[PDB]
Structure formats: C-alpha cells, structure tokens
Amino acid sequence: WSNRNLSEIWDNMTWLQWDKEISNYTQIIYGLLEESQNQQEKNEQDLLALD
Amino acid sequence: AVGIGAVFLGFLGAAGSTMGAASMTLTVQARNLLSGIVQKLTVWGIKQLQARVLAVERYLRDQQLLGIWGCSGKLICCTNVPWNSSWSNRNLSEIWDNMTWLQWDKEISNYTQIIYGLLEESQNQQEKNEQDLLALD
Amino acid sequence: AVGIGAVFLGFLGAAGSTMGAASMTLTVQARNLLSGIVQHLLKLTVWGIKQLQARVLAVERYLRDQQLLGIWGCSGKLICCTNVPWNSSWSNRNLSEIWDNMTWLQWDKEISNYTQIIYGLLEESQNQQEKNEQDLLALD
Amino acid sequence: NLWVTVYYGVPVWKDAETTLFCASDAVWATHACVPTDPNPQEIHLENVTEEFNMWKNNMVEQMHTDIISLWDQSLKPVSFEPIPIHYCAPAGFAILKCKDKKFNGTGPCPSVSTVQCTHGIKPVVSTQLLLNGSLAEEEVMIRSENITNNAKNILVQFNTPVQINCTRRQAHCNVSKATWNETLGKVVKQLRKHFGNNTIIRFANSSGGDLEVTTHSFNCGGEFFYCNTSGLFNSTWISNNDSITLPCRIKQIINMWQRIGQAMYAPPIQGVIRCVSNITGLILTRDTNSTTETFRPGGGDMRDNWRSELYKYKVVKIEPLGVAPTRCKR
Amino acid sequence: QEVLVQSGAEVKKPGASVKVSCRAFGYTFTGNALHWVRQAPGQGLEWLGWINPHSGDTTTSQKFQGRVYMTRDKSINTAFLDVTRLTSDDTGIYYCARDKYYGNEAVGMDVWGQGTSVT
Amino acid sequence: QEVLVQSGAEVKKPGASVKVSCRAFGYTFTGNALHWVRQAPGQGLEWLGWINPHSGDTTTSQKFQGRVYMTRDKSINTAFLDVTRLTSDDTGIYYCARDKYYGNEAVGMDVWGQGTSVT
Amino acid sequence: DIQLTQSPSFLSASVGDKVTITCRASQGVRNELAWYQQKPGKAPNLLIYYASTLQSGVPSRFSATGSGTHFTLTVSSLQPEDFATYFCQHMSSYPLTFGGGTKVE
Amino acid sequence: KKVVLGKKGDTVELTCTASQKKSIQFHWKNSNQIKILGNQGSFLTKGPSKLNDRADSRRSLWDQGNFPLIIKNLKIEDSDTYICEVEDQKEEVQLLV
Ligand SMILES: *[C@@H]1O[C@H](CO)[C@@H](O[C@@H]2O[C@H](CO)[C@@H](O[C@@H]3O[C@H](CO[C@H]4O[C@H](CO)[C@@H](O)[C@H](O)[C@@H]4O)[C@@H](O)[C@H](O[C@H]4O[C@H](CO)[C@@H](O)[C@H](O)[C@@H]4O)[C@@H]3O)[C@H](O)[C@H]2NC(C)=O)[C@H](O)[C@H]1NC(C)=O
Ligand SMILES: *[C@@H]1O[C@H](CO)[C@@H](O[C@@H]2O[C@H](CO)[C@@H](O[C@@H]3O[C@H](CO)[C@@H](O)[C@H](O)[C@@H]3O)[C@H](O)[C@H]2NC(C)=O)[C@H](O)[C@H]1NC(C)=O
C-alpha cells in the first residue's frame, strides 16, 4: 500500500495524489481496521474487569 | 476437533444460538440496521421517504439513548449500577452458555423502564460531578 | 433531616431552581430535544409534507447540535471541561453569586452578548492545541 | 457482584405494524412501484418458535386499501390482468415466514425464516372459487378461526389446480369432472377429520340473495362473468369425458370490490373471449345437528381472498437494545 | 392552585380494612414527597408514614409497621392509603400532606387536604 | 427441507478432469461447512476435503492434494468439486455433505445428497 | 494415518434382538465419534454425533457409548428397517477416514 | 332484551345498532341458531332458514351502524327469539305476532 517515506508523504504532496494511489487499497485496509482492533481491544477488558 | 474458522449466519441469525456465541456477531447486525445507500401520482417520493425518516428517527434516538448512558464505544460497555437479584435469578453458566437472547427478553421485558430509569440517572449523576471534585487540584 | 431519595421534576421543570440543582437534571431535557413518538380518498398531501418537513428540520437541528459538540473537545456530553481561560471581561462575578443565586435564564440574559467569541475560542483552542500534541507524546 | 451491561444490536423483535410498499418487476395500475431484487435473500432461523395469527394479521388490511385505491384508479378512465405484487418492508423491520407444511392458521410454528420480502401475488377479484392462487403442499388444508361456530367461514386450499375455461351460444365455463370429484373427495376427507368418523356430508348450492354471492363472479379477459355454480356443488358423501358446463351471464351495472352504492356501465369490447384459469381453493359456509352437515359457497368479503394467501407472513419490529447482568467493573 | 382532593367519609367494622385516596391538583406530583398524618378527635396529630411518588419507596413508622400501607399511581396523580386490622383507636380524621422537600430532605408541610373521617 | 441437490452422472476418459456441483436448499449456505465423501462400488466410503462456504478456504486430504479442488458461489448457493488427472480408481459415487458444525469444529455430517456416479 | 476397525464385519441376527457392535481406533480419539447408517442405493444418514448423543429424528432404540480407543453402539430391539450397514467416524485430526463397515442381516 | 310486536301479514322492522357508524360484519339468526341474514361486507347474504324469501335489510343505513331486519308477510309461526351477533354481542330481541 504505497511504500513511501515521511519526506515523501507529509511535506510535498496534496491529499489528491495520496488518495489517487490509495484508491486501489480502500477495502483491504478498511476491513482490517474494521475487524482487528474492534475484536482485539474488545474481549480483553472484560478479562481485565475480573479483578 | 478440526476447524477452519468462523461462519456467517446472517441477518437476525443469532436468535437460535447461545448469548455468549451471539456476542461476537453483534457488529454485522449493527451495520445494516440503517442499511443505507438505497438509491401524476406520487409513489416512491412520498409515503416511502417517510419510511426512511422513521428509520433515521429510530436510529438517532437509539444512538442518543446509548450515548446518554455514557459509553459511546458501543456494542459492549459496562456500568456501575448493581444488578437486582429479584429479576429472573439465574446462574452465569445457565444464561451465557445454554440460553438465547429472545428467551431472555421474554423474562426481562417486565423490567425495561425500571432498568432505563436507573441507567438513565444514576451513573451520569454519580460518575460526573465527582470529577468536579477530583479536578479541584 | 431524613430522606427517601431524589424526585422527578419533569421536562423543563427546573428553570426556576438554583444553578447547582438545575445541573443535576440535565438528562431529562436531552431526551425531548428529538422527542420522537409522533406516530378521505387520497386527494391532496398538504399535511403529508409539512409534518415531514418539521421532522426533517428537527433531525437536522439535533445533528447540527451534536456536530457542534463533536468539533469541540468531548462528545462524552452533558458535562465536560476544557482549557479556555475565563477572562474577567465576561460578567465579572463571584462563584457563589452565579452558582447559588442564579437560574439559567438570568445567566443567558447576561451571556447573550458573548456567545460568538466564546464559541470561536472553543472552536480553535482545544481543537488545535490538544491535537498535534499527542503525536509528540507518542514518539516512544 | 453482577452489574448491568448494555448491549447494542440484540436480535429480538416485537409484534408491531407499519406501512409496507409494493415491489413488482419492471400495465394495469403499477408503474409507480419499486423494482424487485434479482435474488431475494432469505435466512432460515433455527431453534426459533413463535406464534402466528392470520385472522389478526394487519398486512391484509393495508393490501385491501391499496388494492381498492389502485383498482379504483384503474377502472375510472387500460388492461385488467393481475400482476404478481411483492410486499417489501422498510429498514429496521423484518418479515417472518413460516415454511412448515402443517398449519391450522394460528398457533406456534416450529421452523421460521426471515425473508426480505414475499413471493409475488396476483390481486384476483373473485368470490366462491379461488382463482390463480398459490397451492399448499402435502394434503388439502382447512383454515378457520372457529370450526364449531357456523358464523365464521371455512377456507379450503388444494393440492392440485383445477382447470376451468372461460368461454364467450351463451357464455359458459368448462370444468373437468373426474379431477373435481377426486379433489372434493380429498376435501370431504379432511372435513371428516374435523367433524367425526360417522358423519354424512352434503354439498348444495347457495341459499340465495344478491347475485354476486349466489354466482361465481369473476373477470375473464376484461369481461364480467357471473356463473351459476349449482352443477358443481351438488353431491353427498356417506357416513364412512366427463365434463361440467357452467352457464354464465354478463350484466352491465354490478356491485363489486366491496363498494357501497355502486353502478357503472361496461360494454363488450371486441371478439371472442376465451381464457384458462386454475381453481386453487374454496370458501365455504357451515349451516337436529348430529349426523348431516351441509356446506355452501360464499365469499363477498374480499379480505378473505388476501387472508387465504398472506397467512404465511407477519411483520416484526426489531428492538436492537438490550441489558444483561455481567461481572464487569469499569 | 396547589390543592389535594380526598375521598369521602367511610364507616367500617373492626378487623376490616379501609382505603382512602388523595389526588393532586396544581403541582407536579412526581416532585414532592407525601405524608399521611392522622388526628384522633379531640387530641393531637399522629404520624403514619410517607411515600415518594416517583420511585415507589415507602416509609412507615414502626408502631404501624405491617399494618398501614401506602401505594401510588402516576397515571391519575393519586396516592392510596390502606389501613388494615381496624380497632376503635383508629377512628379519626386522616390527612395527606405535601412536603416542600428542599435539598432532598423533609422541610415542612405546606399543602394539606380537607380530611377524611373514618369511624 | 434442508436438502442437497447435485448434478447428474458423468462418464469421462482417463487423464481428463470432471466437475460436479452441490446446491443447498432449506438452510443458509454460509452458516455450515461442507464435506465431500466418495465411495467405490462394493467398498467403503472415502473422504476428500471440506470447504468453508463463507470464507472460501479449503482443506484437502493429503493423498488428494493438488488433484481435487473446491470452489464456491454464494449468489446461487453452490459448491463445486473438480477432479483432475483421472484414473480408473476414482470411479464411484461422490456425495456432498453438510457438517452440523457446533463450536467451530466438525461434529457430524447430518444432511447428504443423493450421490453422483462418476465413471 | 488413523485406522478404524469395526467388529464384527458380518453379523447375523433376528428381528427383536439386542445387538452391540464395536469400533476400535488406533489411538485415543477422545469422544468425537459419529455413527452413520446406510442402505444400498441410498446415502448414509446420521445416527449418533459426539459418540453418545442422539440425532434428532433417530428413534430411542439406538444408543452409543465409549471413549478413548473403544466405542460400541447398541440397538435394543431390531426392527426390519434397521438391517443396514453402520459406520464410525472420527474427526480428531487430519485425515478423516471411514471404518470397515458392518452389515447386519 | 327488547320486545317488538307485529301484525298478521305485515312488515316488522328489527333494529340492531353498532357502537360506531361503520359498515362492518353482522349476523341475524333465530333461537335454534339457524342463520337468517347477514353480510359479507355490504353483500347481503341469506341463510338456509325458512324466512329467506321474506328477509330484507336496509343497505343505506349500513354506513350509519343501524343494522335492521325487515320482515314482510308476517305469519304466526315466526314469533321467535332473534339473535343479532355484532362483534361478540348478543342483542337478543323477541318477536310477538
Ligand atoms: C423556589 O424559590 C424558593 C425561595 O426563593 C426556594 O427555597 C429555598 O431553597 C433553598 C435551597 O436551594 C434553601 O436553602 C437551604 O437552606 C437551609 C437552611 O438554611 C438555614 O440554616 C443555615 C444553617 O444550617 C443558615 O446558614 C441559613 O442562613 C439559614 O438560616 C440550608 O441548610 C441548605 O443548605 C444546603 O445546601 C447548601 C447549598 O449551598 C449547602 O452549602 C449546605 O451544606 C446544605 O447542603 C440550603 O441552603 C432556602 O432555605 C429556601 N428558602 C428561602 C430562600 O426562603 C426553592 O428551593 C425554589 N424552588 C426550587 C425548586 O428550587
Ligand atoms: C440449537 O439448539 C441445539 C440444541 O439441541 C444446540 O445444540 C447444542 O450445541 C452446543 C454447542 O453448539 C453443544 O454443546 C457442546 O457440548 C460438547 C459436549 O462435549 C462440548 O464439546 C461443548 O460444551 C459444546 O458446547 C450441545 O451438545 C448441543 N446439543 C444440545 C442438546 O444442547 C445448537 O447449538 C443450537 N443452535 C444452532 C445454530 O443450531
């Protein structure tokens, strides 16, 4: 998903040229952000609420 | 035994499975509650946007009621209101491993407003206005 | 003396009470801002449009108020605290003078002249000075 | 100690009513209607039992008002062919369908599915003989709200479609006789379970009254047929080609579709009108009452036409929010 | 405008039960606690107990514990007083009284009903 | 009601590939995994592999790895089996079977189709 | 792999007999066994899952016991529709394979 | 229990009113529960009783909740007790002649 460094990504381009190349990889990061933390930050504080 | 991973029951599919198993599949039901997208006599342009307005007014009221009993990191949250033991007294292995959600609503439906008043008041006048005393220094 | 517990004053039912007491019953007025409920031979739709317009306007007004609380810091609403210094040019009175001897109506009759500047300070301060701070805190 | 834990998205529903909307394909009165889905999704709900009641169903009243409004728009200036109409639900509501073969009309259903919206139905306007309906499986089904009370009516659903031919010589209908005899043998058998093993069952014609109740009143090809059905319902059954021709008449001003104080003139259009259709069911009325019982043709109230076919479906309203005790401290 | 309207007079045999009602007009009924105070004829005031019209919590004095019950109904803004196992000492006039209820505690009885005579 | 319906019988030369189908009626296809079971004529049953219909993930017996393939189509509720590089040993009856699938593990194959004769 | 032996292979019995047939596994496979019944020209139908629990629709004359390496199924009274072949299945680990089969006549 | 009188060979009117003013289902039977006259909405249907040729009801009052029963050529043998079944209410009426 567009392997670039910080001096490429934060000071010298707009948001249009960012999403123009991230539009290929929309749902593959949106599903991971949908599932991973929302089932992993959950189901562990209930175990932390045991004590 | 051998496994491959989870399966997909679908819309309203957790009414026949156990509550502890139904807790992992709350999100796929919660996505399509509002559904979205959708896309001279007047049909489909009146008497059908009223359905959308009613669905939006139900969803916003439910989301506001969930945000008042303040968690807002939704689909599971805990509260500091103690559970009354007179309201269908059962064990945790009996409810969370052997029972469904619909039979539980069948017993707990007589106590809904008594739940809602205590959840509506007690935490959000006792969790708040003690941080007012905590942030004095 | 002796007590039995709190009571239920009602919707808009504490506007004459004190400042501290009216901040205990904020919750019963947040419900009725959206309210809800509501619930010939098909000649004309003259109040099939206007009631629906009123409901859409109420939904949009509630969404605008929630969006205004969302731009400022919190959305864990009904009370929260921020970091704007309270200048003495806006109604320089003591804490007991405004928190024991005032209704909310007499408060708004004084601070009706300075809503926009307070809203701008809350628009900018916590939303651009608490943010861009945690990224430098999370270096390690 | 246990504390209250609030869950969002709980799959529980309640019995409630709301508006429904049409969905029928992409002529008669349906051009302001939503196109249907290419693949209607259904989800079978195992371990779920609840009760149905097709006599207190609320969908048939809305279908009744909708179909009176659309047909009153249709006739007032057009084709009169019935088009299969699906009935779809808004967001937040669900349609529950009971797919079990054994169903007496009300009571529990041991296996249910949730369907986005129904299989399509043609709004046929007929009395006495059910035309172009959907067929139940297994054996012939008898539905009523009170078998013992004769003040109610009896709904009969077949297993085999009975072929009838509208022809317009006086206009007449053609009925196969042997198929009719074996299907009423099937009907009398199921009436013998519900009334006793030593009962004699008779079938006579209508008792009399308005011509729309006494005769089979239906619409074939835009033409208005009122057929004397004494040749069909004349039989008896003990305590333990051939073809039938039904004479029909065409009237100019009538009473139809349950409207009060009705008169509207209609002439024949052109040509010879001949059509085929399927009897799928019956509506019957029960009448020194220990051995002989006689049932007579009826109809009239057109909500029984929609109740005969919308018995499978009910509308439920999803309540997403729930509370439960849980050992959790925040 | 703030008044309480009471039921009619009742005559009962000993050992029976009596039920009197008290309906509120002119104030929000779920915001002030309600007392039941009795007067034997020719003597002073005797206290029974007091009820919150919102939560349904009750409090009866220990002399009349298990004998005098207080219920409520928010639909018609009314409280019911039940007195069971009657003897001759319970004959007198009964009042429902509204407490001012400032700061979540009992303050003073400002609104009184017309009285119910039971014999 | 919960019934599996497959394609008809196929006769095909050695060295080629064959494709059979299995479509589910009466239940939700994506809620239970599916096994495939073969039987030589006059012999016992033999197992090939099993497919999760929701994810499309496959698990194959290691005698038949790289030789039998499993696909799915959610729009028409079908699971497809492919056998490539045919010999004379594979002639027999192919069944698709629904696992009962309690607790995210294999339990028992309770619903079977009526079989496919592959020669 | 995993080997399963059914004993006996061919059993002869009359109508109404109580018959117990035995399945052996080469290792401990704990309790995940399933019993199936097949008639010729038909698909097998499931009788027992979890090696002791009855399938819905299977009548009460069928039963099954066992653990580890040893399992039995028992019919209390043979009916003429029960004369078929009976299979025992493990799913502890890959591969899943089938037993030798026991036809009762 | 209302009582109405009639003359020999004349027309008697049997009144039976509803709670509301709406065209809605009703039934008219006799003491032996034999159906005389009812509706299927506004389609008047007659029973297998002996009085079927002389039974009549006013359709134009059916919108007003009045559900009458008109009898012409009144004989001796029809002095019975008539049941007007209108939503689980048995408005019993006696006929004398
Ligand atoms: C409508 O308007 C009327 C009058 O305008 C209000 O009635 C007043 O309500 C207030 C409550 O906010 C009452 O104030 C209370 O007075 C109590 C008694 O005070 C006397 O005794 C103390 C010593 O104990 C003396 O110092 C004092 O001078 C008095 O002689 C106090 O004990 C109460 O204190 C409690 O609250 C304060 C809040 O700051 C705490 O600091 C205390 O620790 C304690 O918890 C309280 O101050 C007042 O007496 C009422 N009557 C008047 C002014 O005549 C109604 O309340 C209002 N309606 C509504 C719905 O609000
Ligand atoms: C519908 O209802 C049936 C009840 O007949 C449910 O079947 C039950 O499912 C549970 C778990 O899915 C089984 O529990 C299991 O027990 C074994 C015994 O060793 C053990 O490995 C675990 O404790 C496991 O939970 C249970 O045996 C089974 N049967 C009964 C009679 O309870 C079924 O899950 C329900 N839901 C669906 C979607 O079918």
Coordinates of C-alpha atoms and ligand atoms in Angstrom, one line a residue, chain C residues 9 16-18 21 100, chain E residues 102-103 105, ligand 1:
Chain C
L9 CA -39.4 17.4 38.3
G16 CA -36.5 28.4 38.3
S17 CA -34.3 26.4 40.6
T18 CA -30.7 27.2 41.5
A21 CA -29.7 22.0 41.3
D100 CA -26.1 29.6 44.2
Chain E
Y102 CA -35.9 21.2 49.7
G103 CA -32.4 19.7 49.3
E105 CA -34.9 16.2 52.9
Ligands
LIG1 C1 -38.0 28.4 44.7 O1 -37.6 29.6 45.5 C2 -37.5 29.3 46.9 C3 -37.2 30.6 47.6 O2 -36.7 31.6 46.6 C4 -36.5 28.2 47.2 O3 -36.5 27.9 48.6 C5 -35.1 28.0 49.1 O4 -34.4 26.8 48.7 C6 -33.0 26.8 49.2 C7 -32.4 25.6 48.6 O5 -31.6 25.9 47.5 C8 -33.0 26.8 50.7 O6 -31.6 26.9 51.1 C9 -31.4 25.9 52.1 O7 -31.4 26.4 53.4 C10 -31.1 25.5 54.5 C11 -31.4 26.2 55.8 O8 -30.6 27.4 55.9 C12 -30.7 28.0 57.2 O9 -29.8 27.4 58.1 C13 -28.4 27.6 57.8 C14 -27.6 26.8 58.8 O10 -27.8 25.4 58.6 C15 -28.1 29.1 57.7 O11 -26.7 29.3 57.4 C16 -29.0 29.8 56.7 O12 -28.7 31.2 56.7 C17 -30.5 29.5 57.0 O13 -30.8 30.2 58.3 C18 -29.7 25.1 54.4 O14 -29.3 24.2 55.4 C19 -29.4 24.5 53.0 O15 -28.0 24.2 52.8 C20 -27.8 23.1 52.0 O16 -27.5 23.5 50.7 C21 -26.3 24.4 50.6 C22 -26.2 24.8 49.1 O17 -25.0 25.6 49.0 C23 -25.1 23.7 51.2 O18 -24.0 24.6 51.2 C24 -25.4 23.1 52.6 O19 -24.2 22.4 53.1 C25 -26.6 22.3 52.6 O20 -26.4 21.1 51.9 C26 -29.9 25.3 51.8 O21 -29.0 26.4 51.6 C27 -33.7 28.0 51.2 O22 -33.9 28.0 52.7 C28 -35.2 28.1 50.6 N1 -36.0 29.2 51.2 C29 -35.9 30.6 51.1 C30 -34.8 31.2 50.3 O23 -36.7 31.3 51.7 C31 -36.9 27.0 46.4 O24 -36.0 25.9 46.6 C32 -37.1 27.2 44.9 N2 -37.6 26.1 44.2 C33 -36.8 25.1 43.7 C34 -37.4 24.0 43.0 O25 -35.5 25.2 43.8

